[PDB]
Amino acid sequence: LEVINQQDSNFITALELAVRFGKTLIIQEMDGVEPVLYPLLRRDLVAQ
Amino acid sequence: GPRYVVQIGDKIIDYNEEFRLFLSTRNPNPFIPPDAASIVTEVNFTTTRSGLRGQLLALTIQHEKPDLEEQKTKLLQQEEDKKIQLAKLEESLLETLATSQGNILENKDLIESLNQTKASSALIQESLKESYKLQISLDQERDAYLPLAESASKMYFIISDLSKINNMYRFSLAAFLRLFQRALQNKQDSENTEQRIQSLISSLQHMVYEYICRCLFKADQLMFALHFVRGMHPELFQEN
């Protein structure tokens, strides 16, 4: 687990670590739906 | 993060931990610089003297009589399979000693160990009798060809060094074994075999000399003749 705030300085870096390491992620102070988080909330998975 | 990537041209590619890379080569030269040779360890499959001797010896045994060849094949294969099965039967001796280390006098594992050790002693005595029943039975039917193969292994290393004065004097080995086939297939010599061995070395030197002087330049045949004579009989010119 990692828990992060919305208006936080290290948001996208910790988001990258949470997508890579397989964490379970909780976000605190959301003011809506972020622009960044649209393909992750959808399914956008190109295969390698 | 947890993984690693490695550069291949333009792409970025995940380096899987199960990566093992081997690569073959058909010519000893080409090609290494002195930069890509301090990281790559180099292995040269080569035909040498003692191997080529046994190769031509096996060819002569197979071309003398097929029965001795089939016998020396089947006996060696059965001896190898018996050695592997003997190691397998003696591989349960650790289990019979310390499979559990308790109630070894009680359970019937010590009873089955007696049967296994009986099988081991039977196979050991049988392999002793078999290794006695193949040694002189193969030596007297295999040693009737090696004074042919000895000088036939001399002649190839004679004609190997012919390239180092004139280029395109580079000779293969597949055609050489084709010649060694042609020595049998055209002979049809019915005599004593000990009278046949000098006949076959005699009718092989002629075919070697003619096959090489098909290729040579006209100012080089005396070179080839004298180096060939120095190669075959090094005793007739003594020392210094």
Added chain:
Amino acid sequence: PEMLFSEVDPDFLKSFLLIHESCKAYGATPSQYMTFLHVYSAISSSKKKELLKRQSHLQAGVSKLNEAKALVDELNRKAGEQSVLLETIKAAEVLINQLDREHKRWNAQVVEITEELATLPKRAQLAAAFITYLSAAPESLRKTCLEEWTKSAGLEKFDLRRFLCTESEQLIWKSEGLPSDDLSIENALVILQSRVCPFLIDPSSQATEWLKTHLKDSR
């Protein structure tokens, strides 16, 4: 190596320097010096672990055989004592009929491995130096250098193709199409190396057919 030691002492180290100074006359890159040290450490670790496993199994055997003999040396006597004041002898003798050869076989290897693993470092030095240098030279240079190194250590016996491989693997390699020469078998021993990539100079494709035969199992 003294920093690869914690991570007789000076005789090893000065032997390394003399081996390298003699091997500078064929091309001696410091990458090969470091490859030498890494494969030395790897082979010494694997062989120390396998020898300790062998002594452990032989010690367990020498414990269990002696314990079962001490148990069987008094049980029939206790039954006879109970019969005196007032059925395992056959299977015990049947077990002893195999144990007379079995314990006699499994005896000596305890002292054998005990005297063997005091002679592992110089053997690992020779086995590493052969792999990290001499897979390139012609066989006269193999013979001369192995003889000079073997006289340098002082153990003029003690070959290496039996030290590094056993008979069963040789006949299994022969069962596939590996050539049976000394050169071919030593070359197939050198591709044990996995610090670097092996490079197969090979005019006729038998060794390659053998390698892609017995690498069938993995991908």
